[PDB]
Paper text:
Acinus (apoptotic chromatin condensation inducer in the nucleus) is a protein involved in apoptosis and alternative splicing regulation. All of them contain an RRM domain at the C-terminus and a conserved arginine/serine-repeat (RS repeat) region that are frequently present in splicing factors. Later, Acinus was also found in ribonucleoprotein complexes: the spliceosome, the apoptosis- and splicing-associated protein (ASAP) complex and the splicing-dependent multiprotein exon junction complex (EJC). Acinus was shown to regulate splicing of a subset of apoptotic genes in human cells and to facilitate constitutive splicing of pre-mRNAs containing a weak, alternative 5′ splice site, favoring the mRNA isoform generated from this site.
We crystallized and determined the structure of the RRM domain of the human Acinus protein spanning residues 1008–1100, at a resolution of 1.65 Å. The structure of an AcRRM monomer shows a classic four-stranded β-sheet fold with two flanking α-helices and an additional non-classical α-helix at the C-terminus. The two molecules in the asymmetric unit of the crystal structure are very similar (rmsd of 0.25 Å for 91 Cα atoms), despite the fact that no non-crystallographic symmetry (NCS) restraints were used during the refinement. The two AcRRM monomers are covalently bound in the crystal structure via a disulfide bond, that generates an interface area of approximately 500 Å for each of them (calculated by the PISA server). However, computational modeling of the disulfide bond removal by replacement of C1083 with alanine, results in the CSS of 0. This indicates that in the reducing conditions the dimerization does not take place and the dimeric assembly is likely to be a crystal-packing artifact. RNP1 comprises residues 1049–1056 [KSHCFVTY], with the deviations found at second, third and fourth position of the consensus sequence (underlined). RNP2 comprises residues 1014–1019 [VHISNL] with deviations at the second position of the consensus. H1015 and F1053 are present in these positions in AcRRM and are likely to fulfill the same roles. The aromatic residues of the RNPs in AcRRM are exposed to the cavity potentially creating an RNA-binding area which is occluded by the C-terminal α-helix in the absence of the ligand. Interestingly, the 10-amino acid-long C-terminal α-helix of AcRRM has a caspase-3 target sequence and can be truncated by this protease down to six amino acids.
Residue numbers in the entry:
A (entry chain A): 1006 to 1100
B (entry chain B): 1008 to 1098
The structure:
């Protein structure tokens, strides 16, 4: 299970309910988020989390892939690395 | 998440043959055989389909499935761009 390493972690299988503050608290345990790059979809099913270093992104992917969050989520999270092109497609910056 | 003709499947765990994995993958479309890539240790794979619609049928079918039956994990299936595949292939 090896996506190309980068400073962006793509987390899937998120299920409501949860607040953005709760998600951001989980994410900050393993590094420092770049707030200005952060992205989540309207329905809170997946997000792209840019970290201050690549090493923080690797710590976070490692910690979060295959965990259950929130506690009552029926799914386990899928966490992998993402390229800027993928993030920017979702931000509406690239076709 | 960007829709493509390449499905990336992770959380594979042995034992399984390539025959069994390919049979599974073929349930939902035609593979471009020469494009298929798996790691030497059989933990994740990129699967090119002959059309985009076949890749989407596959992603939908396999994301979150436990395969093989013995796998302690559930599969993660998502789309990939050609240059992700090319990175793993060498280029």
């Amino acid at each position: 299970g090896s996506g190309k390493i980068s400073n962006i972690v793509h987390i899937s299988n998120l299920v409501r309910p949860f607040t953005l503050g709760q998600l951001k608290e989980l994410l900050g345990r393993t590094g420092t988020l770049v707030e200005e790059a952060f992205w989540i979809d309207k329905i809170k099913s997946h997000c792209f989390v840019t970290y201050s270093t690549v090493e923080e992104a690797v710590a976070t992917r490692t910690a979060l892939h295959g965990v259950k969050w929130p506690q009552s989520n029926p799914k386990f999270l899928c966490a992998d690395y993402a390229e800027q092109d993928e993030l920017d497609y979702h931000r509406g910056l690239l076709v």
